[PDB]
Design a protein around this ligand. Structure first.
Ligand SMILES: N[C@@H]1CCN(Cc2cccc(-c3ccc4c(O)nccc4c3)c2)C1
Ligand SMILES: [Cl-]
Lengths: 353, 19
């Protein structure tokens, strides 16, 4: 067989230990999911420094907590805009997930609160910036560098899926790099509790699984497809399926054809053909062996999964960092004042926040 | 080349979700 006795025993034991970890983690998650945290700070506790990113509902700002001097990333959402854009459930769900999960590669929610106008989620500040920026700048990541990041996503999805959470928005734009060079997954706006199937068309065109495009009921396997897209894009510098317009991207995704750069190793191409598998009965992460088909693949043979989890592996890349409030790994955005109104705008809708 | 085709797509910047 592929393993002698010692290696087979060690692998079996490791896999049973994962099961034991996940059972405890699910019990802890369910306690917090049923009793969420609320109203742990207020706006005048922080100085607002600089906008780090923007979205349709609001912005993320670097803030400094006055009493402690600690920096955080504050997501500000305008309640009226959230309602106008039909995002009430997603916004409440994102906060509920963030306060209930706990994993070393998932960004932590440190405080949350609301006022007349806005919702506020104060998260750890992740100072290395977006993987997207580093990838476009460097061009591509070497296979060991891509693998280091991929391993963190594998573990994070193994965790989330054990909780029956599907993530649904993996892409470099949503992965931040911390001061030690490890990933922080951000943005749970599309994540959903799904033990069976779900049907919403959501995600980003290049990262959509075929079954989403084809309007089928789908499951956690869409995240394993997206991992394939991510690994490909990290290692190539461009994603496997692209075109001028989304419809042409979708035709390529559903085709069952994918082409690889000549510098991809055979092990990498094998992994990617098994992740980017249109046929759900054949896609890695969706078979009887579950996540183990991925973790035990030859491309990951050098990966020490526990060492990655414990953050004891030396990162391939440490972002530039001048000090606690350095924002040099984020872009510059036009700044706009935050206006709190005498509207209790949309109080009923956001009672649970 | 494939890279040139990627540049030609115009989708080299940050990509929005469908929402
Ligand atoms: N899913 C879309 C991708 C971009 N995202 C909004 C955005 C754009 C750019 C940067 C950030 C950002 C920046 C810093 C953060 C940080 O330091 N911690 C948590 C979340 C953060 C989020 C947020 C929403
Ligand atoms: Cl069904």
């Amino acid at each position: 067989g592929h393993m002698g006795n010692a290696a087979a025993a060690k692998k079996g034991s490791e896999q049973e230990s994962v099961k034991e970890f996940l059972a405890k983690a699910k019990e802890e998650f369910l306690k917090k999911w049923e009793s969420p945290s609320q109203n742990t700070a207020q706006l005048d506790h922080f100085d607002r420094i600089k906008t780090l990113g923007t979205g349709s509902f609001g912005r993320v700002m670097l803030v400094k907590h006055k009493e402690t001097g600690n920096h955080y990333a504050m997501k500000i959402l305008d309640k009226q805009k959230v309602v106008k854009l039909k995002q009430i459930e997603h916004t409440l769900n994102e906060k509920r997930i963030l306060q209930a999960v706990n994993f070393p590669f998932l960004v932590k929610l440190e405080f949350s609160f609301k006022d007349n106008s806005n919702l506020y989620m104060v998260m750890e500040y992740v100072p290395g910036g977006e993987m997207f920026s580093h990838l476009r700048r460097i061009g591509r990541f070497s296979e060991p560098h891509a693998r280091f990041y991929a391993a963190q996503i594998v573990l994070t999805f193994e965790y989330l899926h054990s909780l029956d959470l599907i993530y649904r928005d993996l892409k470099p734009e949503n992965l931040l790099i911390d001061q030690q060079g490890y990933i922080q997954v951000t943005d749970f706006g599309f994540a959903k509790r799904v033990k069976g199937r779900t049907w919403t068309l959501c995600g980003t065109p290049e990262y959509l699984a075929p079954e989403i495009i084809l309007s089928k009921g789908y499951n956690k396997a869409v995240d394993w497809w997206a991992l394939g897209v991510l690994i490909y894009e990290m290692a190539a510098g461009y994603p496997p399926f692209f075109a001028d317009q989304p419809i042409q991207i979708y035709e390529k995704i559903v085709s069952g054809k994918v082409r690889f750069p000549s510098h991809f190793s055979s092990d990498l191409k094998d992994l990617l053909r098994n992740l980017l598998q249109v046929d759900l009965t054949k896609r890695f992460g969706n078979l009887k062996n579950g996540v183990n088909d991925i973790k035990n693949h030859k491309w990951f043979a050098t990966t020490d999964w526990i060492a990655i989890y414990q953050r004891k592996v030396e990162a391939p890349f440490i972002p530039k960092f001048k000090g606690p409030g350095d924002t040099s790994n984020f872009d510059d955005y036009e700044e706009e004042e935050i206006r709190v109104s005498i509207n209790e705008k949309c109080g009923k809708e956001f009672t649970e926040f | 080349t494939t890279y040139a085709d990627f540049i030609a797509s115009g989708r080299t910047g940050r990509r929005n979700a469908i929402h």
